[PDB]
Amino acid sequence: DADLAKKNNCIACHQVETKVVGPALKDIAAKYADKDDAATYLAGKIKGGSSGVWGQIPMPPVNVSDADAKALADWILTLK
Numbered sequence: 430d431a432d433l434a435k436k437n438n439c440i441a442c443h444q445v446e447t448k449v450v451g452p453a454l455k456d457i458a459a460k461y462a463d464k465d466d467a468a469t470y471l472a473g474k475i476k477g478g479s480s481g482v483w484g485q486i487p488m489p490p491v492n493v494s495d496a497d498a499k500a501l502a503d504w505i506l507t508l509k
């Protein structure tokens with residue numbers, strides 16, 4: 430939820446409505462709204478890192494547990 434994202438520092442670089450360093454969380458949610466297994470894809474982006482999907486700054490891998498990355502992913506998809 431928002432608190433889990435704040436706790437795991439997502440919000441230093443992301444906001445729900447606006448682009449900060451990474452894209453707006455609602456834009457991710459909208460982009461992947463019809464991707465199959467979106468949440469599994471996103472959870473692996475959160476843990477594994479990201480480059481080039483939204484611009485030139487890469488997202489570092491985030492050290493979160495499997496359950497928190499999945500929960501962050503599920504929550505993000507609700508944001509559209």
Ligand code: HEC
Nearest residue numbers: 437439442450451474479480481482483484486487488501
């Ligand atoms: C800056 C230091 C970041 C922190 C801390 C987190 N994210 Fe991030 N994110 C950042 C950038 C610069 C980008 C764009 C990367 C790119 O490919 O251009 C992203 C991307 C994401 C994504 C989208 C991945 C995709 O394939 O579309 C997600 C879902 C994402 N970031 C989520 C996320 C969460 C949940 C974080 C806290 C654990 C978090 N990020 C940290 C920059 C940064």
